[PDB]
Every structure is written in structure tokens, then in C-alpha cells.
């Protein structure tokens, strides 16, 4: 689950189990 | 038709929603819709999305399309049997909804509760809704061009424009769509499907860097542009039209970058200009920033005049002053306006959404302030922007949400918008959406 | 105090009193409750800056009475306390009445439940509500950063107590400095200059503009009025921008950006008015972003059962556009209009409001409509003596604003001129209807 | 009786004869 910031817009990638993990 | 209790001035989605709401709250209510178009009120999204993909040769005449469940449905909101004749509207038992087709309200007198039609007749009202929408804008180059160019240019707004554009799509080998907004992209997808069926050519160009550059962030707009390009469409971003002229018997668009566009037909989808001709006569304030009629949180302009739909610039208490040109917003604004004219005082509370399907691979829902100018935080499942959700932030507060390729997840986004919680991280908030 | 009231007016002032009068006049038996955060009953502000200072009565500061233009004299209050009823008896008194909750500030407004909550925790339900909170004097930033001694020796002038404090200071101290060349600054400068000439003290007025009423009058008229104020006994200091205020040698010392220091014993700050829009945040009411105050429509209506009148009402005039007018006559007419609309008489802003100003014996003028110095102006004067004349304000070629300069009983003509936009080409003929000579 | 122009300001002086 890695992030990326472009100007005023940030994008977060999230894995299924990373989403599952509390 | 001399006097009517409820008068809706623009016959469309907002007017039909307001009439239905007025009938629901007030049994026996007499509602008159004055439509300049000869057609009965109908829903517009099928004209650009669903009527094109219908598997029926008689789709021009039937004007029917299949829904998600597969049931066939007409683009008209209700059959003509639902509407009552305007002549018998004052006498029909338990009220009804009547439409006066082919009549334009040219004069609006706020101080005498009166409206004058283009034919000279005058109608007095008690509660009035200005449910006029807008008219498609025109290019400066198209307007200053000759008469042949304007003969081969269409402003896609109504059923007649749909039938015309479909006839040209069958009989013409090249169509160019000006603009990359909602209507431009939807028409591009539909015409690309038709061209792949036939083998013809479809062009779309716009000044922005991608489709819906005013709505989606730049990466998402680029992804959507790639998708519509793979829909079988020639898409030309960063295009400013200088002039258009008939060369060799076909239209020739000259761009400010020097590139030429040889085409046989032009569809201009360059925005919507709200119909505010009645404001000049009625002395109604026009919003300078957003355009359209300025109204308060209750969609109210004057003591007996409400404005709903495309031409309404309203104040949403949660998010501020807005003008939203969308079908579901038209329905919600019509519902709220009908409630208010019935005698309620509800402000704009239930946020309205909108949807767009730019091919099988692009389908999204959006709620709240979805503006490309606002900063956003996007959380996507697993360069690929297949599934996910995008949050629009004003000051650490989620003012708008784009549900990207996720369905039945609108209640969660609506709940998030309803609260003004300043979320520290939005990944935890996105966890509410089981995007995977 | 009462749980429910039919008509609830928030704020005790000119607009609220005018609204209560209109409501009671066209709706006999109405129960009107005025909630004023100040202990004083409603009173008119103009005398505090013009008439109370020129009274021959030595004890005028205690009785607050003054003589108007005719032989009769009247108090500063709109009505005596016998006019108002108690809030306890308001629901029960026959044929209604008007009541004032003095010293109670509305801190919470809820529109959906039609409810307000006071500073003491009491809650009142209303059917119709007017927000006539007016405004509060703006403060100089250099005064704020100065400290506590300067703020103790600085006066924001809007209330009766401010008048009493400033009058006592003028009787006591020698030098007084007025900051701001607008309406109140100029009026107070003239009054204090007359008082100083009576006594033999020093009065100073400084402002960033080039002349008095620079935002209202054209530059030549501003210069003329500045000279008249200067000969009224005031050391007018134009083009003065305050950067620092600091106590030195037991006296206030204003330091300006151009490098001029002004030693004084007291400072009066008249640097504009901030509309009281605190109820908007808790009530979900829109605030105009380019004029301030509550945004209302042509009928002074904000929501279903909420109207706004006075200096806090940014309204829409059909003829002249969106406006916010901070003037006594505008407060009266907007309060009357708001009360009329509150009692189910939907009518927009039609009757244009005027304002007046008397900056000494030789400067007295009236104005109506859009009177703004940035607008193009055409002045027609009798016989550089700008003694008598008329000034027209134009948007494109239509007269939107007229200043009647030292000519009186000419308001009907200017009102008729503004009412019918005729796009006048030549302006000598329209000036001819004013018998300037 | 004469007319002067200072930017957007137009000053016109008229005597009694000009009514
Ligand atoms: C092809 C197309 C596809 C669309 N697809 C989508 C979609 O997928 N999703 C979405 O959310 N939105 C979509 N929209 C937008 C949505 O349809 C509109 O926002 C909605 O129809 C607005 O409703 P309205 O009643 O305010 O105005 P309109 O629907 O424009 O109705 C206005 C009517 O009033 C008439 N009128 C105007 N002035 C006068 C007058 N003075 N007197 C009498 N009559 C007058 C007009 O001629 C017209 O009949 C689409 C629009 C179009 C054109
Ligand atoms: C000294 C002075 C001289 C003036 N002279 C002239 C003149 O010669 N000519 C002219 O045209 N104009 C003049 N004006 C301007 C004019 O008097 C005002 O613009 C007008 O009186 C404003 O009336 P209003 O009722 O809107 O507000 P105000 O008169 O300010 O009344 C507002 C009231 O509401 C109260 N209030 C505020 N907030 C709350 C709250 N949250 N809850 C409850 N109560 C609240 C305030 O304390 C106050 O009692 C003068 C003003 C001043 C100060
Ligand atoms: N999916 C949906 O919700 C949907 C679908 C279709 C239509 N609509 C509605 O239909 C209406 C029409 O949409 P639209 O796409 O015409 O407008 P829009 O408001 O969606 O976007 C305006 C478009 O016109 C372009 N444009 C403006 N001036 C231009 C110029 N001089 N030259 C070239 N391009 C120019 C802009 O770049 C942009 O692409 C809108 O109200 C829209 O909301 C909505
Ligand atoms: N005759 C009348 O109509 C009349 C008379 C007195 C008061 N009033 C009202 O009373 C209120 C108070 O009057 P006011 O003169 O304070 O406001 P105003 O709006 O009349 O004028 C503002 C004045 O403050 C000055 N100012 C603003 N910011 C400043 C700063 N940072 N530093 C220095 N000076 C600054 C301006 O240059 C101008 O002189 C206003 O609402 C006014 O309309 C009206």
C-alpha cells in the first residue's frame, strides 16, 4: 500500500488484505 | 389556462419531478407545465447513452430502451394518458398535471403573478416554478461562420437533435464533437460504438487535457480519455477552434495550434447557458459567479417563485452556493421545490448525485462538490485506476465523493458527506467502502 | 423570557424599531418581542454625532434631549419606556404590544425548529423572525497591537455610553484625534472642533483618503469639504495611514507610515462598520461575499420565516442591483419593508432611501441612490466656489445617484429622476429642474 | 458658464441666465 502526491491530488493504493487489516 | 394554482415554466426533468412532488403532498393539486418544445416531458440521459445501444431498428420511432433489469421503458416520464388536457385542467376531478406544448413564456411579471406566452396569452399563477433548463452554447467560430457551416452543425439537447444526429451517423462518414464535457464524452462513446458497427469515423476535441477535466482529477481524466479512445473514438485534447469553413464540400475546422480537422458534421457540446431571459423582465437577480437564477437554500427566488433544475443557483448549507446541471439533481431540486411550493420550508439537505457510463470499463457515481479545482484524495483498489473512491476536500472536510467503478456504495458516501468530520487520514474512511 | 412569541426581532435599533412599528401598524394585536443585547431602549444614532454636541443645555449628557429643526425638542429615544411592555405580560396583554429584552444577546439561532437561545440559556420559539443586529465599529489593527493602555484611551463611537465618555474626555483632555474621514469621523471632527473653539483645545482628524468623504463625493468636492472642515476648527491630516500607536510621556502618539507623528490625549476610531453576522454560522444563513451582512432577496427575505433589515442586510434592488446601505433612513425604510413582508405583504425594495450630512454651517447635503465616488460624476454648480449645485452619478448614461449640494426640498426631483431611467444625454437640462438659483 | 473635465468628473458652472 504505497502513496503518491501530485500537486493538490494524492492517490493511495491499497491491497485487499491491507484493506481487511484493522 | 387563464389562471393556474401551480405553474412550471420549463417542461423537463425538474418540472416533472416538481409536479409529481406537488401531487404527492397535495392531492387534487392543479399543475400546469408550459413547455416550448412540442414533446411531452422526457428524460434526457437515454438520448446520449441508452437509445444508441438499443438493439431495435425502430428505436427512432419507439424511443424505448432497456434498463438494468432488462425491462423496456420509454424515455417519456409518463405516457400521454397520464397528462390531462390544459383546457380541462381547472375542471378535472382530483387535479392533475397538464402540459402546454409549443408555448414559450416570454414575459414574466413577478409583481402580478403573471406570465405572457409568445402567442400573447397571459397566465396568472399562485405558486410558480422556473423549471427552465438551458440551451447548448455555440462556438464563436461556428457563429461567425457562414450559413452552410451552421446548416451542418447540431446542438444536441432534445429528441429532434437525437434523431438528426442518428440519421447523419447512418448517412455520413465523419462526425466531429466539439467539447470534452459530459455530453461530449457520452456522445463520443455512442458514436464510436456506431462507427465500429459501421466503419465510419468519429472525432472529439476539447481545450482541456482530458475528458471531464472540470470534474475529475488530471490522472483520472487522462485514464477516462484513454478509455474513450479505446471506445473507437479519435480524441484530440488541447484543441482551441479558431475558425470553421466549408472546404471541398465538407467542413474544415481550423484549430489555434494549426492542425486541421476534415469532417462532414459537427456536434457542438460546449456547455450549457441557463435560460435566464425571464429574469430581465421579472427583475430577478442573476448570479454573477455561477449563472442562472439566484435562489436561497429553499430554492426560492421571490415570495411565490421557486427555481429548480439547471437554471437554479442555490445555497446548500453544507457546501455553499451551487448550480448543478444534472438529471438526478434536477429530480431532487424538483422534489424539494414542489415540497416548498406545497407549503414546506425544507432546505437543500438530501445531496443529489450523478452517474456517467463512458463505455463498459468506465462507470462512476459522484455526490457533493465534485470540482477539479478542489484538492482530492483518491484510494484505489490494488497507473491502473480500475476500482476505488475519490474524496474532494475543502478544508480537511469531505465535500464531494466520486465512487469509481463501485456500486451499491452510495449510502456510505452520503453518510460521509452528511457529517462535517475533519478526517485525519482518509484510508480509514475509504475502508468503509469494500472496494476490493 | 417568554417561551413562544409570534414576531421576534433580534437586536434593538432603528431597523428593529421601524419593523416593530410597521408590524404593529398593519397587524394590530401582534406580539412583537425585541431582543436587544444593550440595556438601552431603542434610540436613534444621528443625534449622538450631530445634535447632542451643539446643545446649549449643560446637562445634555444626562437627559439626552435635543432640539430639531423646528421649535419642538425631543429625546434621543424613539419612544418613552411607557410605550414598551414587559416581556412577561406580552403573551397576555390584549391587542398585543412591543417588548424589549434589554441586556440579552441571541447567541444561537435554529431555523428548522424556529428557535433562538439567549446568553442566559433561555430559549424562545418564534413564528416570524427579523435579524436587525446592525453592525459594530471596526477597530484599527495598530490599536489592537498597541496594548492595553492605548485601548483604554481609544474610543469606538457607536453607543450612548460612547457619547458620554467622549464628551467627558473632550471636557477634560486637550487634544483629541479622530481616525477616519468617513461620515462619523467628519461629523465628530466638526463637533469637537466647535467644542474646542468654545474652549480653546486641539482637535485633529486624519484619514488615508485625499479629503473628507472621499468614498462618497468626487475629488474636487472632497477637497472643498476638507477645506470647510479645516476652517471649522479641525487640523485635518489627509493621506495619513496609521502604522503604530504607543503611549509616550503619558500621552498617545500616533505614528504614520509617511513619517508624521501626532501627539494626542485621546483617540476616536471611526474606521467603518462590521456587520453583526454571528447568528449566520449557527443558523446556516448565507453571508454576502462582496458586500457583507446577511444575503437577502429583493424582499429582504433570507429563509422561509427569517428577514434581515438595516446595516446587516445585503439586499437586491431591482433598479440598482445588490446593495448594503448603512444609514439611518435606510434602516427605517428597510425595517418598515421587512415588517411589511413579515406580515404577508410581499413587496421588494422600491422606495429609494436617502441620507444627509451637515459638516458645518457651509456644508450640508443630501444623497439618494448609488452615491459612490468611483462612479462617473457630472456636477452642475451655481455661477472654485462649490457652494450650491447638484451632482449626478451615472453607470453608463442613466442617473443612479444624485447628491443635492446645499440645495433643500429638491429630493422629489432627484427621486423622480432616479426612478425612471431615461438615459440622459445632456445633463444641463436635467439639472435645470433643480432650481439651483 | 463653462464645462470642465477631470477624468471621469465633469464640472459645469452655470449662471442665473442659464436657468
Ligand atoms: C443528451 C443528454 C444526456 C444527459 N445525460 C445525463 C446523464 O447521463 N446523467 C445526468 O445526471 N444528467 C444528464 N443530463 C443532464 C440532465 O438531463 C439535465 O440536467 C436535466 O434534464 C435538467 O432538467 P431541467 O428541468 O432543469 O431542464 P431541461 O431538462 O433542459 O428542461 C427545460 C425545458 O424548458 C423549456 N423552456 C426553456 N425556457 C422556456 C421558456 N421560457 N418557456 C417555456 N419553456 C421553456 C426547454 O425548451 C426545455 O423543454 C443529460 C442531458 C442531455 C441533454
Ligand atoms: C453616531 C452615529 C451617527 C449617525 N448619524 C447618522 C446620520 O446623521 N444619518 C444617517 O443616515 N445615518 C447615521 N448613522 C447611521 C445609522 O444611524 C445606522 O446605520 C442605523 O441606525 C442602523 O440601524 P440598525 O437598526 O440596522 O442597527 P443598530 O442601530 O446598530 O442596532 C443594532 C442593535 O442590535 C444589537 N445586537 C447586535 N447583535 C445582537 C445580537 N446577537 N443579539 C441581540 N442584539 C444584538 C446591538 O447591540 C444594537 O442594539 C449614524 C450612526 C452612528 C453610530
Ligand atoms: N453524465 C452526465 O451527467 C451528463 C451527460 C450528458 C450531459 N450532461 C449535461 O448536459 C449539459 C451539456 O454538457 P456539455 O458537455 O455540453 O457541457 P459541460 O458543462 O459538461 O462541459 C463543457 C465542455 O465544453 C467545452 N467548451 C466550452 N467552451 C468551448 C469552446 N469555446 N471550444 C471548445 N470547447 C469548449 C469545455 O471544454 C467542456 O468540455 C451539461 O449540463 C451536463 O451536465 C450530463
Ligand atoms: N451622515 C450619515 O449618513 C452618517 C453619519 C455618521 C455615521 N454614519 C454611519 O456610521 C458608521 C460609521 O462611520 P465610519 O465613518 O466609521 O464608516 P464609513 O463607512 O462612513 O467610512 C469609513 C471611514 O473609515 C476609514 N478607514 C477605513 N479603514 C481604515 C483604516 N484601516 N485606517 C484608517 N481609516 C480607515 C475610511 O477611510 C473612511 O474614512 C457607518 O455605517 C456610517 O454610514 C452615517
Author numbering:
A (entry chain F): 2 to 23
B (entry chain C): 129 to 510, 558 to 611
C (entry chain B): 128 to 510, 558 to 611
D (entry chain A): 2 to 20
Article passage:
Apoptosis-inducing factor mitochondrial 1 (AIFM1) is a NADH-binding flavin adenine dinucleotide (FAD)-dependent oxidoreductase in the mitochondrial intermembrane space (IMS). It plays key roles in mitochondrial function, respiratory chain maintenance, redox control, and non-caspase-dependent cell death. Upon NADH binding, an air-stable FADH2-NAD+ charge-transfer complex (CTC) forms, inducing AIFM1 dimerization and the release of a C-terminal regulatory segment termed C-loop. We solved three structures of human soluble AIFM1 (aa 103–613) by cryo-EM: the dimer (1) without interactors (termed “AIFM1 dimer”), (2) bound to AK2A, or (3) to MIA40.
The unstructured N-terminal region of MIA40 mediates the interaction with AIFM1.13,15 A recent crystal structure revealed the interaction of a MIA40 β-hairpin (amino acids, aa 3–15) with the AIFM1 C-terminal region (aa 491–510 and 562–611) by parallel β-strand complementation. We obtained reconstructions for the AIFM1 dimer and AIFM1-AK2A and AIFM-MIA40 complexes at global resolutions of 2.8, 2.6, and 2.4 Å, respectively. AK2A and MIA40 bind the same β-sheet of the AIFM1 C-terminal domain (aa 480–510 and 559–580) via parallel β-strand complementation, adding one and two β-strands, respectively. MIA40 Y3 stacks with F14 to stabilize the second β-strand. MIA40, however, induced up to 3 Å Cα RMSD (root-mean-square deviation) variability compared with the AIFM1 dimer, particularly of the NAD-binding domain, with the strongest displacement of the α-helix contacting the C-terminal domain (aa 345–359). The NAD-binding domain shifts toward the N-terminal domain and dimer interface, also reflected in the relative position of the NAD and FAD cofactors upon MIA40 binding. However, in AIFM1-MIA40, the distance between the nicotinamide and isoalloxazine rings is reduced by approx. 0.2 Å. Despite uncertainties in the side chain densities of K177 (probably flexible) and E314 (degraded by beam-induced damage), our AIFM1-MIA40 map suggests distinct conformations of E314 and K177 in the AIFM1 protomers of AIFM1-MIA40: one resembles the AIFM1 dimer and AIFM1-AK2A structures, whereas the other K177 side chain points away from the cofactors, releasing interactions with E314 and the FAD isoalloxazine. MIA40 adds two β-strands and leads to a compaction of AIFM1, in particular the NAD-binding domain, leading to a compacted active site and shorter distance between the nicotinamide of NAD and the isoalloxazine of FAD. The MIA40 peptide decreased the apparent KM and increased kcat (0.09 mM, 0.89 s−1), indicating increased AIFM1 redox activity even at physiological concentrations of NADH (5–160 μM, total cytosolic NAD between 50 and 500 μM).
